[PDB]
């Protein structure tokens, strides 16, 4: 049941073809549904009246089939354009669009062929094993605010560290991962702590 989208198109096309074929078993108000019978049982002056109704019916059926086929080909073209954009933005390069090439942080996609379709193997990065940590926007060492450069200030309860935003890697808060900007009485939520100078 996984390859359902690819099978639905085939089923719709088969149903359309079968209906177009079965539309030839109708008389549309005539005496028969076979032109051979009408032509071998009636004279040309009187058989055209019966042939015109079949012609009108079959023409209407064929026009309906062509209209439905164009409407379906529009959706198929939209899906093909989406698949091409995905192939260009996730197989030939890493993407940053959320929920565009899988759930999680996109890493790489692998193209795989399929009957009248394409299957993408989206390798994603899903974080796990969360853990609670108390945090502060910055710190006050000598009356100045030390905002982090790339990370977040966390504390295990007693000591303050600086780690990443997607993976817990505690490091000593030094003046190489934090920048000083402004005083220490304008930011709400700041916590006093020491900054190590190598």
């Amino acid at each position: 049941s996984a390859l359902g989208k690819l099978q639905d198109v085939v089923n719709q096309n088969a149903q359309a073809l079968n209906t177009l074929v079965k539309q030839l078993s109708s008389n549309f108000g005539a005496i028969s549904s076979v032109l051979n019978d009408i032509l071998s049982r009636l004279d040309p002056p009187e058989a055209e009246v019966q042939i015109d109704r079949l012609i009108t019916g079959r023409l209407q059926s064929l026009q309906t089939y062509v209209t439905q086929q164009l409407i379906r080909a529009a959706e198929i073209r939209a899906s093909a354009n989406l698949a091409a954009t995905k192939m260009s933005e996730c197989v030939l390069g890493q993407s940053k669009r959320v929920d565009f090439c899988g759930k999680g942080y996109h890493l790489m996609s692998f193209p795989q062929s399929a009957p009248h379709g394409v299957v993408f193997l989206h390798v994603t990065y899903v974080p796990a094993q969360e853990k609670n940590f108390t945090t502060a926007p910055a710190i006050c060492h000598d009356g100045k605010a030390h905002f982090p450069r790339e990370g977040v200030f966390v504390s295990n309860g007693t000591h303050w560290f600086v780690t990443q935003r997607n993976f817990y890697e505690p490091q000593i808060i030094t003046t190489d991962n934090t920048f000083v900007s402004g005083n220490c009485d304008v930011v709400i939520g700041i916590v006093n702590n020491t900054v190590y100078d190598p």
Partner: protein
Amino acid sequence: TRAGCLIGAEHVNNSYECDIPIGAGICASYQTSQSIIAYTMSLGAENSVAYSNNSIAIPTNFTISVTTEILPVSMTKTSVDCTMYICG
């Protein structure tokens, strides 16, 4: 129901996923002595984030997951001659 009268199913006071769509918030499923049950579909679990002004959660591990995305590309190319369908 808000979509009509369902004759043949039993209305349970539980909430499960949607198997057979019926109408406005009503779904059907063949679950337990077996019978068809009608119920109100559930949108999901009721989680509650421990939000505060001085707490943050940082993941310590990770998991690489590979999912599949199936997209149709083309259809069967067909050609219908009118002189063989309307006539012949």
